[PDB]
């Protein structure tokens, strides 16, 4: 199948440069162009440029001076690089492939890469259990969760039981605390009778700081 | 550059109803417009190419029309899984440009929240901070009030709320309210309570605990 997979999210210091890799499969870079689009709060969807089958590049006008796109056909990799970022370059960056080799209807997208431009430092989260109790149990259903606190920058991925538990899961959007660090909770509702039999583990991955925690959550003593 | 203006900014409709999205261009662009869907935490998904041409894998309920400057994306019978943002894109004129998007919200019957409260863990208390979490699960509509009280003292300015996007299956929302205190403050008090007010409740729901 046609797939585009991007390198991970991270923090870029103001004035420094941004680098992202798009590794593609299910097609050849010698036969298709690969485009780059970003999505920001201020400007929304914005086309940045493209590297064509034969190696030529076009860059959108405002980015022509600080953008370069290169590629490695044999490795099926496309390399995106942007210079001197300011805070408003904070955005989700995508690589994309059109339906035909010459066109611009983007049928295939990378998963996106959230890039944060900030002078701050990267910080992994602490993970605390939100334990099930009688005060979180009603009608045979217990709620439980994980508190993912004090990290920077976004994003954090959270799953439960290594992906096997998805039903009734709610991972809330992170809030920005006054410290400038983010915090979120992820909750799930399960049958209360399962609490003594099934294990519940929230899998937390904060890619920017290379922090991975599996937090087991149990009814408190 | 071509400016694409999408209207309205937000659409709110009931399931099974027909819905349509407008994209107006600053100058004529033939039928060189494509439509995309973006779901929560997702990458854009190509729905229609060249104003009206179908895309493999896209449900038949999606269709497009329009010529010149006035374009329309339609969903003949909306389903809950259609909760998303919708974007148009022109490519008659370099560089290709996108609209600012239209958000598609779904209506449903009133559903009261199930309320749960969580004391801070002993692990967090070690770090010197106490977070108390109140959970409002699976409710509609989105509007709700959460009031925190500690030993009958109304709390203000020391909590944060987060609301999920609409659920793609049942069209509900869930909400968290997190009360944050220093461990010192937390230990100086006994009764912790969040009171929830919502349209679907005949009276406020209070969940509480005593520290220890």
């Amino acid at each position: 199948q046609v797939q585009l997979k991007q390198s991970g999210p991270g923090l870029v210091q103001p004035s420094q440069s941004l680098s992202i890799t798009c590794t593609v499969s299910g097609f050849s870079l010698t036969n298709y162009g690969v485009h780059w689009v970003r999505q920001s709060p201020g400007k929304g969807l914005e086309w940045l440029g493209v590297i064509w089958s034969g190696g030529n590049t076009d860059y959108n006008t405002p980015f022509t001076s600080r953008l370069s796109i290169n590629k490695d056909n044999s490795k099926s990799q496309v390399f995106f690089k942007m210079n001197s970022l300011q805070s408003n370059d904070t955005a989700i960056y995508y690589c994309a492939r059109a339906l035909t080799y010459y066109d611009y209807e983007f049928a295939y997208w990378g998963q996106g890469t959230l890039v944060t431009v900030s002078a701050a430092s990267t910080k992994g989260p602490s993970v605390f259990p939100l334990a099930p109790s009688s005060k979180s149990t009603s009608g045979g259903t217990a709620a439980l969760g994980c508190l993912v606190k004090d990290y920077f920058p976004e994003p954090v991925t959270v799953s439960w039981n290594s992906g096997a538990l998805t039903s009734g899961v709610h991972t809330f959007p992170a809030v920005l605390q006054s410290s400038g660090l983010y915090s979120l909770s992820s909750v799930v509702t399960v049958p209360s009778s399962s609490l003594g039999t099934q294990t519940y583990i929230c899998n937390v991955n904060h890619k920017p700081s290379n922090t991975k925690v599996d937090k087991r959550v149990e009814p408190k003593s | 550059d071509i400016l694409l203006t999408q209207s309205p900014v937000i659409l709110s409709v009931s399931p099974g109803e027909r819905v349509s999205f407008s994209c107006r261009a600053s100058q004529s662009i033939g039928t060189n417009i494509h439509w995309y869907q973006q779901r929560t935490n997702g990458s854009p998904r190509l729905l229609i190419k060249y104003a009206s041409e179908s895309i493999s894998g896209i449900p038949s309920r999606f269709s497009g029309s329009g010529s010149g400057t006035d374009f329309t994306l339609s969903i003949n019978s909306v389903e809950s899984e259609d909760i998303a943002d919708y974007y148009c894109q022109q490519n008659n004129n370099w560089p290709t440009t996108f609209g600012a998007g239209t958000k598609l919200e779904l209506k449903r019957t009133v559903a009261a929240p199930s309320v749960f409260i969580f004391p801070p863990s002993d692990e967090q208390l070690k770090s010197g901070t106490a977070s108390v979490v109140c959970l409002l699960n699976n409710f509609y509509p989105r509007e709700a009030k959460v009031q925190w009280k500690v030993d009958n003292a109304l709390q203000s300015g020391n909590s944060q709320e987060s609301v999920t996007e609409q659920d793609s299956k049942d069209s509900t929302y869930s909400l968290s309210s997190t009360l944050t205190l220093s461990k010192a403050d937390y230990e100086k008090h006994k009764v912790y309570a969040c009171e929830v007010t919502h349209q679907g409740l005949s009276s406020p729901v209070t969940k509480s605990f005593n520290r220890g």
Binding site: Q39, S40, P41, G42, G44, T90, A91, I92, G112, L114, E154, P155, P173, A174 | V9, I10, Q38, R39, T40, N41, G42, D85, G101, K103, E165
Partner: peptide, 12 residues
Amino acid sequence: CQFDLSTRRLKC
């Protein structure tokens, strides 16, 4: 309102 980087959704 604007686009939210956390949820990849438009606010308000």
